[PDB]
Each structure stands twice: as structure tokens, then as C-alpha cells.
């Protein structure tokens, strides 16, 4: 299946309390593998996944220099942005950046992205063609012009279409046991009565990876998708994910129906019947 | 692998 490598950067100013708080994180698919926190004691890019730890000292040194460059560059951006938006030196503001690349089943490039936000709003983003820039407003046009003059787009193209995929493919091989694993979801079923004529029946999906999952509902030998309320996929905290879609159609004796779990790995779509 | 190019100030 498809895979990707994403990098997330967040920088928050702290008027009066020194430098901004900078947090950079790295993911391969749904797995965090690196981290940097300006407030941490190490002041180094740290590993968050076994397989990345095998990289030598030269790699870590470089990632650390690079992430620190980003940190400082975002510190400058915070100051410039106050200027563009004519904001006072008081008050905290946020700068966010994200980029990465996607690859399909053939591990060949599919698309790359590189976006930048300010105070939670789009600021500048590289279009799907890796040449054009989408500039939110007038302030962003000034950035756009500066980045077009420096050919940031083609530098980013060189990275996203090349380096990003090359490393993504390296991490997938080295992290074979983890990244290419596929944990089938452990299904479940429960119900806590509350008057008989209208109780609840639960449909779980636990310890699965990757996060991508699709559990739908069909009934009386047919199918619908408008009422049932489901929760956003949540992290278990041990690498796997959880998700449930409860049955809010209690009719005394729950009529005939079952969950239709769809998830990579599971040979055939699983289906849980309810029976005491 | 962080990008080593294309990262400029706004």
C-alpha cells in the first residue's frame, strides 16, 4: 500500500518569556520516528522509533543542525509576520510548517507538499504542481515574490520528488518489521441495557495498524450510512489504533445486522454478529 | 531526512 514521510514544525512566540517554543516532529506513515523540542535538555534531534536509532552519528549531527536552522528561521519569520500584519510585540503567535512526500504500492513518487500557516490559517502553500504558490493575502504575496525570486519551488521540487522518496524507501526497508507490518484489528461487541425498548450495542476495533480503517453498517440484508455516530480514530499509545461505531438503533431485540470491517491485512472484510 | 534546501524565511 501507499506510504509517506511527513515533517511537522510548530513555533510559538512567548512575549517576555525569552525565545519561542519550537517543536519539530517526523513521521513515516502513522509512526513518529524523530523529535526535537527547543525546551528539551538534549538540544538534539532524538529518535522515537527503534529502526532510526541505527543511523550513525553523522546522520544525527546533520538532522540536529538542520532542525535547529529551522528553529531559528521560524524565529525570524515570527518577527517579520508581526510586521506584515501590523501586530504589537505583545501577544503570542504561531507559525506552522509541514512537508512530505507520498508513494504508492510501487514505492514510486505520487505527490509532494509543503505548506506554511500563521495563527492557524493558511499563509503560503506549494500547489500540487511543484512550481506554483498559493498566496493567501497581500502579506503572503510578498513572501511569494521573494520565494519565486529565489526559486524555492524548484529546490523544494528537488527534495520532495527525489531525496524525500529516496529516504522514505530507505526507512521502509530498514524499518521492515515495523513500517511494513500490518496488525489486523481485534474486533469486539458489548451492550449495557437501559430500559429494554432502547439500549445500546457497541462495535469496537482495537490494536490495529495502520490507522486507515473503514467500519460501516448494513442491516436487514441492505445498507445505509447517515445516522450511526462514530468516533475519530484514536491512538492506543503503544503504536496501534482504536475506533468504534456504536448502534443507536436499539429495538428491544436488536434486529439482524453486523459491522463490515474493511482494513488492509484482514484477508476478507470481517463481520461481527451479536449473540449472547 | 530533513530537507537541506528550500527552507527560507518568509
Amino acid at each position: 500500500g501507499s506510504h509517506s514521510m511527513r515533517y511537522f514544525f510548530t513555533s510559538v512566540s512567548r512575549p517576555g518569556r525569552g525565545e519561542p517554543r519550537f517543536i519539530a516532529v517526523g513521521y513515516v506513515d502513522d509512526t513518529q520516528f524523530v523529535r526535537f523540542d527547543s525546551d528539551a535538555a538534549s538540544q538534539r534531534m532524538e529518535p522515537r522509533a527503534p529502526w532510526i536509532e541505527q543511523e550513525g552519528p553523522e546522520y544525527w549531527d546533520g538532522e540536529t543542525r538542520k532542525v535547529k536552522a529551522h528553529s531559528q528561521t521560524h524565529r525570524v519569520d515570527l518577527g517579520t509576520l508581526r510586521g506584515y500584519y501590523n501586530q504589537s510585540e505583545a501577544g503570542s503567535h504561531t507559525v506552522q510548517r509541514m512537508y512530505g512526500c507520498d508513494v504508492g504500492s510501487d514505492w514510486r513518487f505520487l505527490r509532494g507538499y509543503h505548506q506554511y500557516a500563521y495563527d492557524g490559517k493558511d499563509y503560503i502553500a506549494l500547489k500540487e504542481d511543484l512550481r506554483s504558490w498559493t498566496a493567501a493575502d497581500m502579506a503572503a504575496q510578498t513572501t511569494k515574490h521573494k520565494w519565486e525570486a529565489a526559486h524555492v519551488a524548484e529546490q523544494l521540487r528537488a527534495y520532495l520528488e527525489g531525496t524525500c522518496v529516496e529516504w522514505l524507501r530507505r526507512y521502509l526497508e530498514n524499518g521492515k518489521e515495523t513500517l511494513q507490518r500490518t496488525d489486523a484489528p481485534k474486533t469486539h461487541m458489548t451492550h449495557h441495557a437501559v430500559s429494554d425498548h432502547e439500549a445500546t450495542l457497541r462495535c469496537w476495533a482495537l490494536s490495529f495498524y495502520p490507522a486507515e480503517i473503514t467500519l460501516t453498517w448494513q442491516r436487514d440484508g441492505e445498507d445505509q450510512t447517515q445516522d450511526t455516530e462514530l468516533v475519530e480514530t484514536r491512538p492506543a499509545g503503544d503504536g496501534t489504533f482504536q475506533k468504534w461505531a456504536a448502534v443507536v438503533v436499539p429495538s428491544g431485540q436488536e434486529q439482524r445486522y453486523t459491522c463490515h470491517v474493511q482494513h488492509e491485512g484482514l484477508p476478507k472484510p470481517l463481520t461481527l454478529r451479536w449473540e449472547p | 531526512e530533513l530537507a537541506g534546501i528550500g527552507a527560507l524565511t518568509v
Partner: T-cell receptor
Amino acid sequence: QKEVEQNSGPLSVPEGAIASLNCTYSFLGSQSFFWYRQYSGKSPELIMFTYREGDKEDGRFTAQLNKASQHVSLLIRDSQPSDSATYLCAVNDGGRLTFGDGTTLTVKP
Amino acid sequence: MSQTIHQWPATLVQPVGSPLSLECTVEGTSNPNLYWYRQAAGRGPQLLFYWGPFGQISSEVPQNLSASRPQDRQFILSSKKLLLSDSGFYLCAWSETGLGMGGWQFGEGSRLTVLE
């Protein structure tokens, strides 16, 4: 293990001929490459840089980058005596430049 | 309005045990990355310090030397007591703020000879 290797020279090339300078780097994650020219007693001057595979021409100078073999080249067309100097190959291994020890070229008039 | 970089002094001849002070000044950009390199005869420049606009980023710890950046565009290298091994060609350099292709130019360098 040498991070950036370059034959030392002196390399001789007849005036008018093409001079080719080669470089090999060991750091897989290097994303930009540079060539500097250095005359005796002077600081290095940036000749050119590149960040993508292929060739890049600027006047008589052509830089070449092959990532599969981590090799970087520089060609000087129509060599002149004033091209005599030491050419340094520099790799960017993360926010900084790492240099080779350079190749000393002598173009004979 | 373009970029330039300059360092001072150009040549120095000092005895072992004396203090060292080299200056670097850039114009044409703001918030640049500043670098100090040292070059030995026959070899290429070796990184001593790499500073971003807000502080040192390099993790190297060159013996008997230290750097400082009193202003955005003024970079200083110094030593309190030079060692024979401190002879060399001190090169200063800058790069546009961030991670990019702009800049990467050296100053004219400072040649230092320490004598017993």
C-alpha cells in the same frame, strides 16, 4: 573514511583543452554541492553550485552531479593559464559546507 | 544594495601565548548564518563555528578558540592565549537565513602565524 575526496594534483592541461575535476563524497544525505576556485594566497571564490542531478553550465564552467555514485564533476572548457588554481569541492551535509582538500590545476600556455 | 563580506585584519604575526581577535562584517542581507573556517596548507577549510542569526548551531568544540556575534552582521573570533597549533588561514563566510542556495561567499580571509 574521507568525507570528500579529490585527487590532489597538480593536474596539467594544455591551454585550450577541457579540464575535468572529479570529486567523491561519502555522506548519503548531502543535498547541495559547490565548487570554489582558490588562487595562491587568496580565499576561495564560489564558482558554482547545484542541487539536482545532471549538468549545470555557467560560461566555461559545467558542474555535474551523479547521486547514485556520489560523484560531482567540474569541467572547464577552453582552459586558460589564468584558470591555474586549486579547485575545492564542497558538499553540504546539513546547514554547513564540508570541503575536500582540492585539486591543484595548472594550465600550460 | 547587494551582498558583501569583509574580515580584518588580513595578516597577523604573533607569539605563542598572546590573545587573538579577528573581525567579520557582512552587508546586503539580514539575519544571516555566519561561519568561521580554518584552512591549513594543502588542505580544505575546516569548520570551527556555525552560527545562526540567534546563536551557535555547530556542536564542535575547537580547543582554545571561541566565537561571538555582538550584532546581527558582526562576527568575532578570539582566543585568550594562542598555541603554535593555531597558525592558519581563518576564513569567514555567510549564507542566507535558513537552508538555501543564497550566499555561501567567503571573506578575504585572515592569515595567522604563531611563533615560538
